[PDB]
Design a protein around this ligand. Sequence first.
Ligand SMILES: NCC1CCN(c2cc3ncccc3cc2NC(=O)c2cnn3cccnc23)CC1
Length: 286
Amino acid sequence: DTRFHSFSFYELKNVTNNFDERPISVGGNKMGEGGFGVVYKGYVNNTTVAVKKLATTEELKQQFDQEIKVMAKCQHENLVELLGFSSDGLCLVYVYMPNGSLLDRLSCLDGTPPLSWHMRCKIAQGAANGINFLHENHHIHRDIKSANILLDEAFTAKISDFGLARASQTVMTSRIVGTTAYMAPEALRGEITPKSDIYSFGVVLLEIITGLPAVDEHREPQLLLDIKEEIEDEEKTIEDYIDKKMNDADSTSVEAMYSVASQCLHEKKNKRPDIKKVQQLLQEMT
Ligand SMILES: NCC1CCN(c2cc3ncccc3cc2NC(=O)c2cnn3cccnc23)CC1
């Protein structure tokens, strides 16, 4: 509990009730899918944990070994903690995040009340501190989205899912990974740059302001990033997009965060601010 422990598959199989695919609310252990695995709630040393059971065969093992690597090298207060792993029976064990993810909380999943603007402000500051740490350590996340911004007991932002993280000039790849709805144009075209993480963070900001998912096949607009075009071509204001589930959302602060989101969502990757400027602008906001 000061070190990365190697877990027996039978210890994990046991504390997750044989990896009980049923959700928590019905009495099961499943917390949700993501990061090329299923996340189960476990119980080790009278202490709660989150167990990711991973599910090509060599591509997955690569993402397991990447996660252990990144998680040992990158330890910050705005990053999730790795407790241990298992390869004996592939499971990654993490410190449990009682408030799940920013995505679940923005959706008010399983009776949770909406997040206030004040907590939404601190979450965005925290997530930006987390990306800044990775970026300061020549790491590119590649899959920044609200589903993997996790929330602790004080609703502190804790960035997760490092399986696709790249450790480094803009380079190109043959294997394009990430979530379309959050991805910058160049990242969709095969480029690997921390600039693409900035763009992805910009989408996260609009999700925070509006409470809306990044993509909706029937909604107009379908892609949340397109609301920037509706605001620019004066058919709407950010005011019109503010999440109705808020009490405390002030217009001066909402417009300050949207100014940050707008800069992050620049289609020209070089015109975007770096994460240090995103941090300074978000701190100025409060
Ligand atoms: N996009 C994948 C999802 C997978 C499910 N996750 C969790 C949901 C929760 N629901 C209720 C209460 C506590 C919860 C904790 C979670 N997870 C964790 O505690 C957790 C800790 N590190 N970690 C890393 C990856 C995924 N989950 C976690 C949210 C993210």
